[PDB]
Amino acid sequence: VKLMIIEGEVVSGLGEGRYFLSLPPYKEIFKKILGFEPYEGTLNLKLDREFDINKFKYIETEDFEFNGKRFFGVKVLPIKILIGNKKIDGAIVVPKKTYHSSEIIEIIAPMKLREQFNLKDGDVIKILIKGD
Ligand SMILES: [Cl-]
Ligand SMILES: [Cl-]
Ligand SMILES: [Zn+2]
Structure with a gap:
């Protein structure tokens, strides 16, 4: 593991x-x-x-056709978001186009962590890949 x-x-x-x-x-x-x-x-x-x-076992979703428009699938890598004592399930998400640097990751979770854990920018968290 x-x-x-x-x-x-x-x-x-x-x-x-x-x-x-x-x-x-x-x-x-x-x-x-x-x-x-x-x-x-x-x-x-x-x-x-x-x-x-x-460099991981990512799921890549398929492209969709939705109301005439085509949409590109996204690479998702599941993770555990470690906020203090609590340790939520989530994923790192990588869409096709992204203007940001490679040192930025995006985390999706079942709820807005920002609010649900009153996070401000500058705050640090740990996340947990269980892959490589
Ligand atoms: Cl944001
Ligand atoms: Cl969020
Ligand atoms: Zn960006």
Whole structure:
């Protein structure tokens, strides 16, 4: 059981509220794949080094056709979000296009962690990959 604890600083990204948090196929598939409807948003962390999902066993969702538009699937890597004593299930998400640096990861969880744990930017958490 090869684990991986990684530390990251809560920051804010762009979060147009993004097709893949917002459309039912994505909803339903995260339900399949991760077993939760993720909260419609992402907690972005700044890591101490670059991060590469490909260096892991990621699920890659399929592209969808939704109301005439095509939508690209997303690479998701499941994780445990470690906030103080509590230790939530979540995933690192990587869509097709992303303007941010490789040292930023996005975390999705079943609820908005920001609010549910009153996090501010600058705060640090640990997350737990259990992969490599
Ligand atoms: Cl954000
Ligand atoms: Cl969040
Ligand atoms: Zn970005």
